[PDB]
């Protein structure tokens, strides 16, 4: 994928994946993805695998 | 905290000026490494390096003085550019086993 989108990344040959309601999702990564993303609009996201 | 630094600061400062001062055991034991460390930077020697060293010390004269001045007299070794020497006596009322330290020379 791309930490869902968070093109950064973090935590070994395992990692981990957060998640939201509605069969929707959020595979995941670092404390730079999280919080931010968990609170607005992905599009606008830069740094990473979006505003790449 | 802000004090740990401050120290290292003025001590690092004063010192380079003389190159061996009189503070107690510890005090010295540290002003070393640090100050020490700093040195190793005068050694690096450049835009950056300087922009640091100063960053703390704050002061052309020196800052430069060392980077150029001493730095060299050291360009060769491997840290240790300081020889922390304990002292014989002790500040009164107190009774603190002060001590002296210099730039190994």
């Amino acid at each position: 994928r791309e930490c869902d989108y968070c093109g950064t990344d973090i935590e070994p040959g395992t990692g981990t994946m957060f998640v939201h309601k509605d069969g929707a999702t959020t595979h995941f990564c670092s404390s730079k993805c999280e919080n931010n993303a968990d609170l607005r609009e992905a599009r606008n996201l830069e740094w990473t695998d979006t505003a790449r | 905290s802000s004090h740990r630094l401050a120290l290292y600061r003025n001590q690092a400062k004063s010192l380079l000026t003389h190159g061996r001062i009189t503070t107690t055991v510890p005090k010295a034991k540290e002003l070393r490494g640090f100050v020490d460390h700093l040195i190793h930077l005068a050694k690096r020697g450049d835009l950056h390096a300087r922009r640091l060293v100063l960053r703390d010390l704050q002061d052309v004269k020196l800052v430069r003085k060392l980077f150029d001045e001493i730095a060299p007299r050291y360009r060769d070794r491997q840290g240790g550019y300081t020889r922390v020497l304990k002292l014989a006596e002790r500040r009164r009322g107190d009774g603190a086993p002060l001590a002296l330290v210099e730039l190994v020379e």
């Binding site: - | 061996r20 020497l85 304990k86 002292l87 014989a88 006596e89």
Partner: protein, 58 residues
Amino acid sequence: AKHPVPKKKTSKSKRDMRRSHHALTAPNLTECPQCHGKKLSHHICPNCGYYDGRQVLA
């Protein structure tokens, strides 16, 4: 506000006994490097300057 205070004249005896475990112990000092005399085990002095380097006065 003296909640707790002794309760029975401490007994000289004991008292002192207490003050007993106390005691000094002369500076372990040694003798000059070449300074010739007795110095603070490990140091130059108003007799030295040496060690290996003349870092002092007199």
